[PDB]
Amino acid sequence: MLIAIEGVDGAGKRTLVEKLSGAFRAAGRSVATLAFPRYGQSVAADIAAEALHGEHGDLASSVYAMATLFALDRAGAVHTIQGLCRGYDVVILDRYVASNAAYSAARLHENAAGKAAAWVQRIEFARLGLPKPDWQVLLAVSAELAGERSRGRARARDNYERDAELQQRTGAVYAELAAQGWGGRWLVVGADVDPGRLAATLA
Amino acid sequence: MLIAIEGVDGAGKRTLVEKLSGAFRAAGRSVATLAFPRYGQSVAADIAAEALHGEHGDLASSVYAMATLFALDRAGAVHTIQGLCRGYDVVILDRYVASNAAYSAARLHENAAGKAAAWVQRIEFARLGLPKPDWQVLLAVSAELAGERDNYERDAELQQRTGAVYAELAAQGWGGRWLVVGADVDPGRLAATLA
Numbered sequence A: 001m002l003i004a005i006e007g008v009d010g011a012g013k014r015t016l017v018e019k020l021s022g023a024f025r026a027a028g029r030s031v032a033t034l035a036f037p038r039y040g041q042s043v044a045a046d047i048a049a050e051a052l053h054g055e056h057g058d059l060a061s062s063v064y065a066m067a068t069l070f071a072l073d074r075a076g077a078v079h080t081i082q083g084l085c086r087g088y089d090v091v092i093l094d095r096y097v098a099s100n101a102a103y104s105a106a107r108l109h110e111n112a113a114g115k116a117a118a119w120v121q122r123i124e125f126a127r128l129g130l131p132k133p134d135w136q137v138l139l140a141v142s143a144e145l146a147g148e149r150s151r152g153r154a155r156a157r158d159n160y161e162r163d164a165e166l167q168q169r170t171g172a173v174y175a176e177l178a179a180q181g182w183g184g185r186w187l188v189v190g191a192d193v194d195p196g197r198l199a200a201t202l203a
Numbered sequence B: 001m002l003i004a005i006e007g008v009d010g011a012g013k014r015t016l017v018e019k020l021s022g023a024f025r026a027a028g029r030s031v032a033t034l035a036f037p038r039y040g041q042s043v044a045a046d047i048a049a050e051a052l053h054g055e056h057g058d059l060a061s062s063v064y065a066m067a068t069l070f071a072l073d074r075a076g077a078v079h080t081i082q083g084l085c086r087g088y089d090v091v092i093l094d095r096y097v098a099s100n101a102a103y104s105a106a107r108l109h110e111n112a113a114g115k116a117a118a119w120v121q122r123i124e125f126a127r128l129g130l131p132k133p134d135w136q137v138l139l140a141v142s143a144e145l146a147g148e149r150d151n152y153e154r155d156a157e158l159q160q161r162t163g164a165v166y167a168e169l170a171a172q173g174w175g176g177r178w179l180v181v182g183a184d185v186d187p188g189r190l191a192a193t194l195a
């Protein structure tokens, strides 16, 4: 059971993942969680983070270069994810493939029907062989509240987080992805969602 | 001993790799060779080539992104390089870390003493762990002779400036000692000089 948690920056994903893990375990299911990008476990991830903070020359200026590094990070995580799914009943991922599609489209002012979304789909699911998630849960939230959360919980904000319009468009692209079942079945929830009920719903 | 053969497209690196290897073997030394980018064996390498052919949107428009891909390709070969270095007296690499410094600087109109070349050293050698070559052999060729024999290959201006950064990397001893040679260099004398 592979579950992916998606959403904009400051949406509260970490928290949702926490509550959901407990609920699942409460219902006796073994849970494992993994977050992307894998800071500290991937050079591709680390360079991506440093790039979002202005480092590495013109790296961050390329939408596809950034998407590639995140995709390369997940690719190096294929055996890790398969290993988790084998050792636990529920594997929960804080951010996954859909993140790349939502942000890349948003940075290019494209929607779910744009080239970037389709490109991410082919690259990660078809070529890099990333395991399709059984569930993609979009934690939808107020753009203002999310923006403020990042501002408060800030370590300094990167170039994506300081881009209020990028965040709004990313929220919108996410909604389109969820509505059309991009990459599988989605579940849209709010911050005030009941863990136990959500868990019972997903599993 | 780890040896890297550097040079622009059309310099004749493969031929030199072949001759130098035969020379070392004749001198009673085992030799293994490896070529970069590892097209067909690396995803980073393949995406880079594809990007150089107009694929993957705006990826190729970024100098550092392209540079990062070639470096990640080399990173994936560290274990292979370390295995060769343990098994053979001489390991010859057709294109290595200096290629990234040369092409990146050339794309940015920088010189061997600039930011990009310094960046490549900080990334590949220390962060990624690529062994620093004992010798970097530059098969120097003028733009005219090279021109006589993707986005990069098609750019003569880029090829010319790349040759220029190579000439400077060699003079400044970027990443270690260098040797400049021509496609007519005598294998035996070269092997004796590198021994």
Ligand SMILES: Cc1cn([C@H]2C[C@H](O)[C@@H](COP(=O)(O)OP(=O)(O)O)O2)c(=O)[nH]c1=O
Residues within 6 Å of the ligand: A009, A036, A037, A049, A052, A067, A070, A071, A095, A096, A097, A099, A100, A101, A103, A104, A160, A161
């Ligand atoms: C995982 C991932 C993140 N991103 C974006 C979303 C975030 O702005 C940023 C970093 O991811 P994030 O999980 O927000 O990291 P941090 O812990 O540093 O806040 O990059 C992508 O564009 N694609 C991806 O595949």
Ligand SMILES: Cc1cn([C@H]2C[C@H](O)[C@@H](COP(=O)(O)O)O2)c(=O)[nH]c1=O
Residues within 6 Å of the ligand: B009, B036, B037, B067, B070, B071, B095, B096, B097, B099, B100, B101, B103, B104, B152, B153
């Ligand atoms: C290995 C490597 C190649 N390149 C380049 C030069 C070539 O134009 C292209 C592919 O190399 P190739 O022609 O030897 O197969 O990528 C870099 O810019 N940096 C590197 O580190």
Ligand SMILES: [Mg+2]
Residues within 6 Å of the ligand: A009, A010, A161
């Ligand atoms: Mg974030």
